[PDB]
Design a protein around this ligand. Sequence first.
Ligand code: K
Ligand code: K
Ligand code: K
Lengths: 250, 250, 250, 250, 250, 250
Amino acid sequence: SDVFHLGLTKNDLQGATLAIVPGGPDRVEKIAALMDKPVKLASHREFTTWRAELDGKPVIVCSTGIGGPSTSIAVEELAQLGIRTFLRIGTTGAIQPHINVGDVLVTTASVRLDGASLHFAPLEFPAVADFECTTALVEAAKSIGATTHVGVTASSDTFYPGQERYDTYSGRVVRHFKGSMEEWQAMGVMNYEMESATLLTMCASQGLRAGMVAGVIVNRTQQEIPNAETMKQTESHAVKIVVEAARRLL
Amino acid sequence: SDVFHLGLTKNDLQGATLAIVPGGPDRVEKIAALMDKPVKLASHREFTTWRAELDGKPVIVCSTGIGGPSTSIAVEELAQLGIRTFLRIGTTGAIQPHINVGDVLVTTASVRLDGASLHFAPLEFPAVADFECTTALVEAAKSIGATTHVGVTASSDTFYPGQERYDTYSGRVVRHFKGSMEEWQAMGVMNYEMESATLLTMCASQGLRAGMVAGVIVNRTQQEIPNAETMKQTESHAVKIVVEAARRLL
Amino acid sequence: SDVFHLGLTKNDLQGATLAIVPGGPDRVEKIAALMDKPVKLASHREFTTWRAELDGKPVIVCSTGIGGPSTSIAVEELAQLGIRTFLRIGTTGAIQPHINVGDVLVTTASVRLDGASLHFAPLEFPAVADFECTTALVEAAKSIGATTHVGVTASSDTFYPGQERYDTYSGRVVRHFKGSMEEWQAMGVMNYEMESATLLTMCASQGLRAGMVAGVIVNRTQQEIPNAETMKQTESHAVKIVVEAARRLL
Amino acid sequence: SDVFHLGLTKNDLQGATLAIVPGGPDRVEKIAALMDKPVKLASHREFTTWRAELDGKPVIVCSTGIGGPSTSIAVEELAQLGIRTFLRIGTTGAIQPHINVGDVLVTTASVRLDGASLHFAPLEFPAVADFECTTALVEAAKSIGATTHVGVTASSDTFYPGQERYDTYSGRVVRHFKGSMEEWQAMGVMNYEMESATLLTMCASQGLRAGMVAGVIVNRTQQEIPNAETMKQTESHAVKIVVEAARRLL
Amino acid sequence: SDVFHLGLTKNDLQGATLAIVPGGPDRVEKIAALMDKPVKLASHREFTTWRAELDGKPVIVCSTGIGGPSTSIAVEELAQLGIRTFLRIGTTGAIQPHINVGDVLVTTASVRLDGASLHFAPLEFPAVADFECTTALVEAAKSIGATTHVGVTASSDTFYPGQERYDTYSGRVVRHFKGSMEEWQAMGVMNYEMESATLLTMCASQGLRAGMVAGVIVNRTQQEIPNAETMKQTESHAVKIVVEAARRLL
Amino acid sequence: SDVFHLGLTKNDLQGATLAIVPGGPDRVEKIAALMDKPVKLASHREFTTWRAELDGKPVIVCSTGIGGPSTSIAVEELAQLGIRTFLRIGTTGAIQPHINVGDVLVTTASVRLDGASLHFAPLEFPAVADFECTTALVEAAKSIGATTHVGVTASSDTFYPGQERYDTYSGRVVRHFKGSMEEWQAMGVMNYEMESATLLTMCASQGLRAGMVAGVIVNRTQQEIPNAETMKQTESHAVKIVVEAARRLL
Ligand SMILES: [K+]
Ligand SMILES: [K+]
Ligand SMILES: [K+]
């Protein structure tokens, strides 16, 4: 293989220059399923790669795994194989009371609560999305009548203390993150996830285009018994949006 | 006056909720002249305010002064007066060799090389522009046929060592900023200016919309004798763009 | 003109090597008025420059605008024109209960809550005043019987959250600055202003002499209806002191 | 399931309180095969868990994924399931010229070049291994006659720029990490990997025991063509060591 | 003398390569007294050096003074004279309720709340002890039946605010250290002392072996009238342990 | 004793409120010999205290030890005993080529290269000397005809890598401090020593007066064989200056 981890040789890619990069292989398969001729290319550790075709152009779909470090390997190796545009879709807990479960969020830029972004640019650099990608995602969302919010996302290297969860083995949060959630809420941050600050920073600092969209599965500000059926629909909607945005970027 | 520095009452604004915020009064008057029924409201220190009408709605134009600190007083006091949308227009030196004098930059987010942004959000929070405002500026640029780049800007608390200039009384640059220019170049940063990291961060973190456009009057990467008429024309082009974008945000 | 912003050509200066640098042009005119042959030299953006003569030697007076960034341009360009000594006068809110309105404060060194100082020296370097300048200011204050306090000042890039004001559009202060005021009070800081950390650091790090004096117009620790007449007298007193100190430095 | 990601109930663990946590499932299965009555419990995303018996006690083996973020979810959720001892086994590139391929490293503590460790303890807290676990790994290494080094490891959120690799799409490394490798070399750091600063810090700071051993598959300081069989044998040796050490901690 | 401060010429040392480095000369004399042929070599400022012999090999004992700076001079100059292994013994206040007065603590690594460690390695590097030294100290403690705890220690440049003591001239603690003690307790830190972060970091970063042991004289978590007699016994026990560990390292 | 380390009761001080704080006891005795009725009060560890009379008022002279940590214990415990004014005298290596051996430095404020100052005030707070004390030291210097420089000093937690010395066991300096000396040189820093950033910050932030003077015994910028008699004479000159300044502060 032409790269170290993903097990992909460049002609495998058939000249593709856009990849969709969700977190896990299950969703890779769902996204491939909305395009033509889906074929599984490789599966090695957390990286599962499919190829498909969209309006006659090849598109790659490749799982990142959880967190910026594995995200950074996937984006780096796809770039080594010629990918220049990256779009992430995920699911997310919102932290604003006006955002509802089933809404869609388009991330303009992220609060860098990760470690990998710093390996690309010092903290003062913005983890900002590419304007074309963001545009395609906002337009795509409107093409299926999604309720959309466009704004900042907080991107944490942890699922638990970095998102100020206390339902843990220790039940406490280190001082730097204690009270962080309410600061991010006051500053209008939409939601937490775990990979965007790494994704956006490494692309924006290296001449790659990236954008990021997510469906809301939980609203942290209001207790509510999760509805598995709403979640599955929300996921399906966010997948269509990412594909439709790719269509507009090809 | 209803505010501490601006010498403005809310009554003066006649219900305006959008401000164009250039740096200097000469530019204030130039922007207002493009619009209908422009009148000077006040001038105290570096803050000069005019009111004008655009498609029949009142709009404020108010100078920030140089740098994040006076910017931060203008923005806060206009917000206190009911402004919720802020558009900055500037003129700038580009640091990328593909960007020419006369091109227009629209800033998606800024490298925080200032101090005042930290008084609003820790450094990990992105200095990012509002999506609607960036969309309107990009559309306005296209509508006059401008050659446009959309991207990251470095926003410095100094004109000289923070922009890595050596043509100074000291002729040197402190260690932290020595070599910085080449780093930002490698990371695709378009240009330097001195107020956007303050404006964008304090707006993004307080639920105010902001965008920023600039005309290129210099290219730091190419020696060339400045053309005083080219610069005037580029200023004209940027001013028209910012008025057109405001038209789309009213 | 010999410099980029101030619009000054060096022979304009007539060999001067000392400048007084207050914030705004109104006060430039007041300070020029206490010396011989005052003549206005230039006015461009927030920088208004006069020249006058004191015991037969030329002195420049030049407004800085609000905040370290514009302060840094003025000091830099005056230095390029041969100024080697800089004295600032301003007005200030004190934060200690033993300091009264109408007292005068002489700043030995400043807490660096600004951004521009870092473009001259890393944060560990002290924003300290020059000993001769400080001496001339303390002696000058005593020559008109002023009640004087000599000590540390906190120098903020913002007027509002950085000075822990809550009477704002957001009515909140970011976590790093929330509770900061009471820390500075406990540590004996006299007052807040907005330019000294930039002024003192850039001069002390570049072989220039600077000093800083201010009249107290407000005491933050005790509510009190401002008396416009006390303020005007205090200002006039602080202007005489700065001039008289310059006399001792020439 | 009793946890959010792992798909495990406490019942599944049959009272296990020690986990071996390698990076990938292939290694999970290889570790479990060394022990008695191994059975697969669950596989979701990058987390694959088997149970097995060692000297008649249940032991869990569960993959972390690449990087501190997914590591941090595995460790937290196993802790929630009653795991109190964690042993990591990895394979690694050494950066010291006295360390050969096939040698074993046991890590006393790690250089924190990751983000997730900060979500547990500020950077001044040591990423240090539990003494009993390090003792058991050193004893286990000696018991198979391994050539062992005991020392500090650098733990990076990236495989590429944080390990100072230039064979990349950008071919460059941000200023902070340029030259870093030589610094760590001078300071005696044995090797790079990507999860130990997270694992050790979050265990050391929450009263969980952790240790870490790795087999050397590369020496970055010596060009040499990789031998695919040497690497397999080194992986075998490291796996045996980690099982033997677990034997001593049960 | 061969060095700048300690007043020692290398042949004085008779080929020794291990030094015990307690804080003060009184204890130097106590430690020398447990070995053969103790002879005082020098006394200059806080550095008092004796030589003695242990199983026929020369050992040096040299006081460090209080705090990392003087500790850093002593270790540096002994290293210039050929010492390669350093063992510190001291006395300490514990901050955990399960540790009793008269227990012994062996430090695996330290929280860096000092300044000197940074002059050897950036903060992310662990202030970790050498594994052999730590082993010899744990084994030595067990050889006299000591109640031992092995773990992390917090190493402060101050005795008072850095250890969160309020019984002071100011009776307050600066914000960064206010509430620090309870964070360190939650994270399982055993005790405070003042030299280990400097000692461990400078040795671990420069190929020197160091270890650190201490007897508990106070337990901060429970008020208790100090018993001078328990303290003296505890000291005598900790001295025997350090000597006995040296025996195992020679 | 009324304090924990110094072995002093308040009674011992006979109402003294000024201390001269040199580094070592030999200098303690030398200072006291200049004054009337000097008597040794106590000696424990690096702290040796004498009392003496100056113009009929009791004055304390007490050694700090090397470095901010032991300095910080001396200053705190003398403050507890009623000392409110502290004057340090040292001997130092200059780093500017205009400063000669035998010159006297008076420090207006210090570059904080230590750890203990942070335990009193964050790094943005200036390590600045009290104006009265600096005035008295400058006056005392002039009164004996000393060649004096008044300015910034760099205060390091180490004698070796923090002063950028390479004549060491490692012969190297960590990245952060490599090149630092030249930076401080460019920024006009006069000299290095090891206690002033601690002393000045902790005094300035707690309402205690402090000043600092030093005699130059080396010029790092000029190779020259040290003259043992020149150094003794320079020490004499500095001691006389500090006693004269104390005379003016009583
Ligand atoms: K992962
Ligand atoms: K300004
Ligand atoms: K000491």
